Design an enzyme around this catalytic site. Structure first.
Site, PDB file in Angstrom:
ATOM      1  N   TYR A 187      -6.734   3.173   7.456  1.00  0.00           N
ATOM      2  CA  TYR A 187      -6.199   3.893   8.586  1.00  0.00           C
ATOM      3  C   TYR A 187      -7.490   4.203   9.296  1.00  0.00           C
ATOM      4  O   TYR A 187      -8.296   4.816   8.596  1.00  0.00           O
ATOM      5  CB  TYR A 187      -5.528   5.224   8.205  1.00  0.00           C
ATOM      6  CG  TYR A 187      -4.033   5.118   7.919  1.00  0.00           C
ATOM      7  CD1 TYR A 187      -3.123   4.520   8.779  1.00  0.00           C
ATOM      8  CD2 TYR A 187      -3.599   5.628   6.731  1.00  0.00           C
ATOM      9  CE1 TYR A 187      -1.806   4.451   8.410  1.00  0.00           C
ATOM     10  CE2 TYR A 187      -2.279   5.564   6.361  1.00  0.00           C
ATOM     11  CZ  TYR A 187      -1.406   4.969   7.206  1.00  0.00           C
ATOM     12  OH  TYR A 187      -0.114   4.876   6.770  1.00  0.00           O
ATOM     13  N   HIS A 208       6.736  -0.049   8.744  1.00  0.00           N
ATOM     14  CA  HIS A 208       6.235   0.857   7.742  1.00  0.00           C
ATOM     15  C   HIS A 208       7.204   1.328   6.682  1.00  0.00           C
ATOM     16  O   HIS A 208       7.089   2.435   6.171  1.00  0.00           O
ATOM     17  CB  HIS A 208       5.615   1.998   8.514  1.00  0.00           C
ATOM     18  CG  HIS A 208       4.497   2.764   7.821  1.00  0.00           C
ATOM     19  ND1 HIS A 208       3.219   2.831   8.169  1.00  0.00           N
ATOM     20  CD2 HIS A 208       4.677   3.615   6.761  1.00  0.00           C
ATOM     21  CE1 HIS A 208       2.663   3.706   7.374  1.00  0.00           C
ATOM     22  NE2 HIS A 208       3.541   4.167   6.531  1.00  0.00           N
ATOM     23  N   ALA A 238       0.655  -1.278   0.000  1.00  0.00           N
ATOM     24  CA  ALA A 238       0.000   0.000   0.000  1.00  0.00           C
ATOM     25  C   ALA A 238       0.690   1.346   0.000  1.00  0.00           C
ATOM     26  O   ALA A 238       0.607   2.048   1.002  1.00  0.00           O
ATOM     27  CB  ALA A 238      -0.927  -0.038   1.146  1.00  0.00           C
ATOM     28  N   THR A 239       1.433   1.779  -0.999  1.00  0.00           N
ATOM     29  CA  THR A 239       1.895   3.165  -1.102  1.00  0.00           C
ATOM     30  C   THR A 239       0.801   4.251  -0.937  1.00  0.00           C
ATOM     31  O   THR A 239      -0.278   4.127  -1.526  1.00  0.00           O
ATOM     32  CB  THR A 239       2.572   3.212  -2.473  1.00  0.00           C
ATOM     33  OG1 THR A 239       3.954   3.075  -2.195  1.00  0.00           O
ATOM     34  CG2 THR A 239       2.216   4.431  -3.317  1.00  0.00           C
ATOM     35  N   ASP A 280       0.707   1.141  12.978  1.00  0.00           N
ATOM     36  CA  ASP A 280       2.017   1.585  13.383  1.00  0.00           C
ATOM     37  C   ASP A 280       2.219   3.054  13.030  1.00  0.00           C
ATOM     38  O   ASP A 280       3.336   3.575  12.883  1.00  0.00           O
ATOM     39  CB  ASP A 280       3.050   0.627  12.677  1.00  0.00           C
ATOM     40  CG  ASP A 280       3.303   0.735  11.165  1.00  0.00           C
ATOM     41  OD1 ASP A 280       3.000   1.747  10.535  1.00  0.00           O
ATOM     42  OD2 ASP A 280       3.836  -0.230  10.615  1.00  0.00           O
TER      43      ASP A 280
END
Ligand code: HEM
Ligand code: HEM
Ligand code: FMN
Ligand code: FMN
Ligand code: FMN
Ligand code: FMN
Lengths: 382, 478, 382, 478
Positions: C153, C244, C95-96, C181
């Site tokens: 998120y 991350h 996931a960029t 995170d």
């Protein structure tokens, strides 16, 4: 090679005032830009790849100090007894062959003079293959008080040597250092690129040489505890832990690393008091001599620093190198919290990573080429 | 006869035809099975590709691998002007002259070569970019190649003193033949890239012309027939070894073993570490399965080979102790702990690290005296060979030093390499305090930091960016 | 900044033929000489000093292989099941955030297309902070057969998120990756130099999100075994071991190093089968994915390679990066002597120096400056 | 009056006289006891040396150390032309302008400073060579200095997840005073080298003007009187600490402690790690015992100091666990595990390595809650401070970041450094999953490779000399 121009214009008074040499590396930097290729090559070498040669020094870096504080240190005393006599500092000039290549004029007589001309006397070890006769060198000495030792390469024509021992005893040298690690003289490739010892020595040959002299005998070139313990079982005075400046076998262990491992054995076998272990190769700093004296060595030796201090500044340079290292050992002792050599024992030392001798895995060339990291703040252009 | 454009016509992948030295061959079926990938044939099919083929192939190969019904009759004289190939040096330029004047005796006279590293240095300079790419590369960003050598530096010495090391004898016995020196030359593909006139014949000559003579392992992808290499051996007392890849058409391999036994090679080193070709990016940058090296070969296959042959069988390519023990268990003569020069699987371990692991276990399991372990990869200096032999290896091998020596100086370069390294071994054996290979035992070695293969934490570019070092004292002018 | 000139003359057809990209590093080299400072900085960063960022990769180098020989390897199969579905290769596009900075035209829809346009389908993970709506991206997909996942998120305005979950379930995503995170988004200093998430998430908030959806939930960002075991005790499907991209806390351990240590625990506690552990950060080579699959990971992920293959070659570049790494995993398996993912277990691996994470002692600058070593043979000048 | 040449006359070592701002002092006895070695006085004795003295000395010093019978009466106007000194910047040139235009607001505007490393970078550039030599050097080829910081990189983190890290509180209590932040500024000699107008007054101001305020340790060899530093504190709530070296004339130290208690400094950090001055070759290149720092100070001496003072006594300079245990045993308030910034004994260990060694032992021997351990040297990033506090240190200190910040940007540079580092700590505490300094416990740390302080084998210049790397794909032009 016509650089002789370059060299005597460097050497004639571009050389810094001897007062401006801060450490033993400065003399090496200076010798490198001035000595003849012929001599730099023969002086600075190692047996190919030269990893033991660098390793002798760097092994002093796996050992750190655990200093004492609030210990009185106004007064510190660095003198020790080495091989009967009591000498001023714990280190000695060790036996370079041919000192005339960089100091053509006076060769190894200038080291003799440098080692007794000032306040401190530092033992001199003379090379069987010195380029000045024993007689010359001993007779150059400025004091009754400075002490000299003789390292003997025995010859295949044993009578040659046999006369030589009785000749140097007469001349008053104060012990014999048989160098036993050079059956053949290692491949110093830096020499070759620009281009005496018997092979049969054996413990019995030392046994008879015991019987044939009064001088204390030290086997110079021991490289594993099992020969330190033979050196003890046959009765010589000392053993100099050495791999010959990392100029004989190249993947040889570093001297301090063998000391750390041979001294506890000499306590388990109690023959510790029976035997003077010296150590040489890589010392270039007062704290390397202190790491060596804390581990057990009676005294420690230095070939090359003296050799390039002599070739650059002759007797005066060998005197200065002695003051330089004597100041380092003195100041660092204040700082360790000790006052006398006998006070240096091992517990002043962290030996927990002595064996952190690592070879790394191959650098990831592409991850590293494409990677780029933080930058610091830029100024204004305007 | 057969005519040009009707031939040229076939300028396609898959259904592909090609001219090689007067005869026409349908190279359709062959294209996807060519050893160094089909692209090279592909980019030049339909043409007269002889330029590429004739200087680069074990002569016998067409008549030996190309089934005769694909061997088409004669092309009428010539393929028209841009239908005859330039020689294979992908990525060269007119360069072949600056490199030829580099080569032109400007090569230092042989008595000044001091180590095996000088022949590398020399060969990178004078070699043709395909060849240098080929000979020097590793598979895949290269950490098992560099590692192979750096792993010897994880081992130190414990030399004994005051031992009379006056006469020194470095001869040893490999695979039941007393050999003058404890090392050998490994199998290498195409020596004609670097030594185009003689290729593998000059290493046959360099090994057997001096006083010291050294065993030659001949590769199955050699540029010369084994017939010539053996023929060109200069001394009846020198030894030759055959290195086999088994073909998917196993009657072909069956016929390769009976033929090289008749020629008299002394042992069969079967290469098991290359089922798929390793990716060698430097070579790719410059331009995996195949039936040639059968990828289904297994232990039962070697068991069958034993029956078929009287020569010793040495499995070359082993990478863990379990495959040493199994090869001891099927009863093969020896194992070569090798990972192909580190051009095959890339984080494969160093063979000296595996040797060290293995040999205690071959003593515990009491198989040690019934299997001869050789080692290669990464050996460059006689102390390397001594480290490999104090740990138990019967003999050590070298791949690249001998191609860089042979490419630069031919047969006297191979002799001079043999000489340079025999001298480094004798020298170091004196300073090590021993006199026979049998005296080389592990108790002479420091192995306490054998396993200190570290990767340190990535560090700190801005702390170092601003840090200034100490400095030496400068001359008053400079 | 007027480099736009430089950049579109680089980018317009100086870029190498996509057929000429040999590895994932080539795409990174190309993205670096062409993307906007704005985007390279946001893409290539790490949280300051970036030592976890490099460490994630280099930790794959402390682990070596112990290959099997004479094992049939004509036929090798790399497909595995990840999170219910059975996928083609063991790695996924991860996931960029904002894919439009380097691929302004189609953003994260081009990754969707690249991940299903060719022979292989590779899972897609979509960013809650993607710069294209979920709807867009999912609808760009070329197959019914390619699988997509959603990383969420959660927001402080919980209803926003709450709608979003039910909206993406509807849109057919195949699981939820909560990224846990990033309570605050780490200091990516390279960004700053040129210049949504709640802070309160807590295990109970995941517990309720379980109860509120059908999709399998994976906590993305776990960094010690004690949270892998909580992730198990509360019942989520997976745990993605991640720090991350080394963009959140900088001296964070490397993911493979935590895996090596958390999987044996999940066997001692038997909850191993209960939990899909994935791993990401630093994979750049087929052999890093194989070191990760041999140790236990279900699948492994990659952010940046895909991100710069997309920004350079859009959908076609994401397709090619998938073929490139799929070939590496395939060929290296032949070479390991294995045929199916389930055959990769740990005994194919030497983990004896996994912990050889060393920091060296300071380079002896003067011994090193004055030292000089062997030279190779010179040619003739004439 | 007193007359010029009769003064100048005294242009000798040993019997030395000097002019400093109108009065004449016999500086014979003083020369060999001057803190930074007698050479500086020596090379300028007999002259008017005011230039060197007036911008570089804690004003009070002549009247405080020079016994009055050496305080000779007024020199008649002036020492003739080359008898009045140029300012001390040994080794400068006209340079002081390129460096002043470098400095001239070309200094990036403070909101662009992103880390403590930028203030270094900036200060190396704009600082006067003596000052940069002074502030940045280490004793003696410098491995305990670099090590001090690299040792933190031997420690990693084990962060916990899904913990609500919304409000974060980094305040802590040092030495019975609740402080806003877990770090302090250490004692540094001469801040006027870099910040000539205010020196240590601007750090007094930078620490106490923002919202975060940080404890200031004031050095006994400070360029300013303690009177001014305290006076210039901008907030009555900020804390000041005094760092003492005990004089060989112990009534002098006795008078330094009662005076700085009256001024209200909160604690006495007695520096025991510098009996002999460390050799700092970069500074020497540019140009050991003394009575000033008495070299016979011992544990009984601190025991006497306790009686004489009511402030806490912290022994700064400890280097092994045994000296932590003894200082806990004589009952002193705390110990600062420090090796003076690595300008004193050079292969001394890293204080974090000693902290790690020590704190288990201070729990086993049940003394842990009766001794506050601080740590300094090598701290540059808030994760460094967090590593130091998860291992038990009460507070961490910084020497150089604050002189480079203060020299470049003055008081707002010190504030901005305080800010930069408080932010790095709060940030990393969230990502670490904790919210109070008390929550920072060792179980959050990876210590498995704490001791991997390696020196690798010297390697192999010709293997690497000939090795070629892999390469990336190039653009078609470049
Ligand atoms: C007629 C059938 C052919 C046979 C039996 C044959 C056989 C082989 C063999 C066994 C090898 C050595 C592989 C290696 O270096 O690893 C080889 C390599 C090679 N063959 Fe052929 N070959 C054939 C046709 C061709 C043709 C038609 C060409 C011309 C395009 C060719 C060009 C090459 C080249 C240049 C290599 C080495 C690749 C490199 O540069 O590294 N071969 N071939
Ligand atoms: C009158 C008696 C003097 C007193 C009480 C005094 C005191 C001190 C003290 C306590 C310090 C700080 C040492 C350090 O930086 O580590 C110092 C340093 C120094 N003093 Fe003095 N001093 C005296 C005379 C002088 C004189 C006459 C000069 C002029 C030559 C002078 C020049 C300096 C300099 C320049 C330093 C710092 C050395 C450097 O550049 O790093 N002092 N002095
Ligand atoms: C130029 C040179 C010549 C040497 N010649 C001898 C010699 O005549 N006899 C001997 O025993 N040692 C010889 N040594 C070595 C010892 O004196 C000693 O090992 C010393 O050099 C130790 O190494 P270091 O210079 O690294 O401290 C020589 C060393 C050098 C560098
Ligand atoms: C150019 C090249 C091609 C090779 N071809 C073969 C080959 O035909 N057969 C084989 O079994 N191995 C081959 N090897 C590798 C081995 O013979 C051998 O293990 C050797 O290269 C060892 O590595 P070193 O070159 O680092 O010594 C080749 C090596 C090189 C470098
Ligand atoms: C440019 C960039 C942006 C990212 N944005 C997010 C994001 O939106 N959400 C998320 O959970 N992870 C984000 N990631 C990180 C993950 O997708 C993942 O950790 C990945 O980058 C792993 O690191 P690698 O690129 O080193 O393999 C981002 C990573 C990069 C490099
Ligand atoms: C320029 C300089 C001078 C220093 N002077 C003193 C001093 O006056 N008193 C003292 O106890 N220590 C002094 N320190 C060192 C310590 O305050 C302190 O431990 C600190 O420098 C820690 O190292 P760091 O600078 O790497 O953080 C000085 C440090 C520097 C760099």
């Amino acid at each position: 090679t016509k650089e002789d121009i370059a060299r005597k214009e460097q050497l004639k008074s571009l050389l810094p005032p001897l007062d401006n040499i801060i450490n033993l590396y400065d003399f090496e930097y200076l010798a490198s830009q001035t000595l003849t290729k012929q001599a730099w090559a023969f002086y600075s070498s190692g047996a190919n790849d030269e990893v033991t040669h660098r390793e002798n020094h760097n092994a002093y870096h796996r050992i750190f100090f655990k200093p004492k504080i609030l210990v009185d240190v106004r007064k510190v005393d660095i003198s020790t007894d080495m091989l009967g006599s009591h000498v001023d500092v714990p280190f000695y000039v060790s036996a370079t062959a041919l000192c005339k290549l960089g100091n053509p004029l006076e060769g190894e007589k200038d080291v003799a003079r440098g080692c007794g001309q000032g306040v401190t006397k530092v033992p001199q070890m003379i090379s069987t293959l010195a380029s000045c006769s024993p007689e010359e060198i001993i007779e150059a000495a400025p004091s009754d008080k400075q002490i000299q030792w003789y390292q003997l390469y025995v010859n295949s024509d044993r009578k040659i040597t046999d006369d030589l021992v009785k000749n140097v005893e007469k001349l008053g040298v104060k012990a014999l250092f048989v160098t036993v690690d050079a059956p053949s003289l290692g491949q110093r490739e830096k020499d070759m690129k620009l281009k005496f010892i018997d092979p049969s020595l054996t413990w019995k040959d030392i046994e008879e040489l015991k019987k044939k002299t009064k001088l204390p005998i030290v086997i110079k070139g021991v490289q594993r505890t099992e020969d330190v313990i033979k050196a003890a079982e046959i009765g010589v005075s000392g053993v100099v832990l050495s791999n010959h400046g990392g100029r004989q076998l190249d993947f040889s262990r570093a001297p301090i690393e063998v000391l750390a491992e041979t001294m506890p054995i000499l306590e388990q076998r109690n023959l510790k008091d029976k035997l003077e272990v010296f150590v040489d190769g890589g010392v270039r700093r007062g704290t390397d001599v202190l790491k060596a004296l804390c581990l057990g060595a009676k005294g420690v030796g230095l070939g090359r620093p003296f050799l390039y201090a002599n070739s650059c500044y002759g007797r005066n340079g060998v005197e200065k190198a002695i003051e330089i290292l004597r100041d380092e050992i003195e100041m660092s002792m204040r700082l360790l919290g000790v006052t006398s050599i006998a006070e240096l024992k091992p517990d002043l030392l962290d030996l927990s990573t002595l064996k952190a001798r690592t070879v790394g895995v191959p650098n990831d060339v592409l991850y590293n080429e494409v990677y780029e990291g933080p930058t610091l703040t830029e100024f204004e252009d305007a």
